Design a binder for this molecule. Structure first.
Ligand SMILES: Nc1nc2c(ncn2[C@@H]2O[C@H](COP(=O)(O)OP(=O)(O)OP(=O)(O)O)[C@@H](O)[C@H]2O)c(=O)[nH]1
Ligand SMILES: Nc1nc2c(ncn2[C@@H]2O[C@H](COP(=O)(O)OP(=O)(O)OP(=O)(O)O)[C@@H](O)[C@H]2O)c(=O)[nH]1
Ligand SMILES: [Mg+2]
Ligand SMILES: [Mg+2]
Lengths: 162, 106, 106, 162
């Protein structure tokens, strides 16, 4: 089958690193994304149509224009970024409450786990206010986008949950 | 963190003559009763962003609307280049933003 | 300071169906390289304000341009109704202003 | 003959009063002009095309779009308003220095002479920085727009000097 995925998260979460690590098997140097990227990634016979939309604050009000038709939401989080974690919860909840994004299942990449003193997957779950949510299908996946760790485990969770 | 090949071109994207656009016009978008109106050539019009559309085109526009402080409609035209990638996908880089706002001469 | 007769109507100008426009486009005006472009119907285009032109029309538009803080051209369309006066002259009241500005995303 | 006149001055100087006193021989109630008016006034076999453009500060940047083809400038001053007389000077000089207004003869209406303690024609002359200007043809005309005093004396001066 085929699946349409939207990948969102604050700037510098690691979205573009993830997208290009998954598609080119390479850890490439990234520029802050002012715009968006589209790749089609094939894994376990699933054709993932992934949309990496920039996360700089002045691009976020435009996120809603890529909601329609999303089957999978990937939300990527810098786990070493303690300052902006609450902000990150606020964005995530803004996304999953929109009418167009009601049926999309949610994958959180708890990214940058390699980094000194990064918050763990369960703490992320807590601080993103996911624990309470029982009407939506979600999962927090620990990852390191530069090594590739967790990434395909995340794509596997999606495979299973559609 | 490598000497890896570039994903795509960065400078600009006008390999060919003429210019073809993706006109991304959301369902929520409504036509303003303004003199200024958008005039896009060789535009494919879409309500939803779409890869096959970006594949055929060299330029991308998104029409976005909010309510401004004075309760007036504000229209923003987000424009950008469409580059093809090594992965056979697409990338869109926003170049500039046209903003159209109204107000009484008060 | 009197019980004198009013000079002209105040409310609005709608004598007739449809609308004819004086399009007052100064010689200093340059066409921007924008998607937003002005679209005026049944228009008389003039480079200089002209009474005969106002006499014939219901609506008035002035295209005005300035350079804004970020070195970008800012285009304003000043719009208003044309009223005839007891004196047989013309009055234009400005009703609203369309501003069109450009900016990079950063 | 025919003469094109541009009439400027700060808001509430009395420009519209002048225009309609001259055209209608009536002291009418005016509203601040958010826009401009046009009347053709015939006197001593001259057909004066007079453009009265509002003086409120958010309109002054537009003044220049009415400069072209102007044969006579009428600048109207509230002679009771001392606070803003310097402001008027600045505006006047901003006008007459434009390339488009290079050939226009200049008529000042030192208006509101009826008002208690009004600045006299000669004081207006000093305070508008006119005394130093010699390469331009100018004249300060005392006037009271509501009575009509000086108005036609002003039109006579434009007639003689064109
Ligand atoms: N240490 C570490 N760095 C990472 C990881 N993933 C991404 N990065 C780095 O974080 C920085 C930002 O990564 P991006 O992928 O460009 O961030 P983004 O989500 O695309 O952010 P925007 O384009 O601004 O919206 C880059 O230096 C990446 O190399 C990770 O797992 N561990
Ligand atoms: N006492 C006195 N009042 C005057 C005289 N001339 C004008 N006025 C009053 O001054 C006020 C403002 O006059 P306007 O003719 O509306 O001034 P204006 O130049 O058109 O002002 P804008 O429309 O904003 O550009 C009105 O109340 C007039 O009646 C005058 O000579 N003497
Ligand atoms: Mg990125
Ligand atoms: Mg007036």
């Amino acid at each position: 089958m085929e699946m349409r995925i939207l990948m969102l998260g604050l700037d510098a979460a690691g979205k573009t690193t993830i997208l290009y690590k998954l598609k080119l098997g390479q850890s490439v140097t990234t520029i802050p994304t002012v715009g968006f990227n589209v790749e089609t990634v094939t894994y376990k016979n699933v054709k993932f149509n992934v949309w990496d939309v920039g996360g700089l604050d002045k691009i976020r009000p435009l996120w809603r224009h890529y909601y329609t038709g999303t089957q999978g939401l990937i939300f990527v989080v810098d786990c070493a970024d303690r300052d902006r974690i609450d902000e990150a919860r606020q964005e995530l909840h803004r996304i999953i409450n929109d009418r167009e994004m009601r049926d999309a299942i949610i994958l959180i990449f708890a990214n940058k786990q390699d980094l000194p003193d990064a918050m763990k997957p369960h703490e992320i779950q807590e601080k993103l206010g996911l624990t309470r949510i029982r009407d939506r299908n979600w999962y927090v996946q620990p990852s390191c986008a530069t090594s590739g760790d967790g990434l395909y485990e995340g794509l596997t969770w999606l495979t299973s949950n559609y | 963190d490598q000497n890896a090949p570039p994903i795509r071109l960065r400078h600009r994207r006008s390999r060919s003559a003429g210019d073809r656009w993706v006109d991304h016009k959301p369902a929520s978008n409504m036509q303003t009763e303004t003199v200024m109106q958008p005039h896009v050539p060789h535009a494919i019009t879409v309500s939803v962003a779409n890869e096959k559309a970006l594949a055929k085109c060299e330029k991308y526009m998104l029409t976005h609307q909010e309510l401004a402080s004075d309760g007036e409609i504000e229209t923003k035209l987000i424009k950008g280049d469409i580059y093809k990638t090594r992965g056979g996908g697409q990338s869109v880089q926003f170049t500039d933003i046209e903003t159209l706002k109204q107000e009484s001469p008060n």
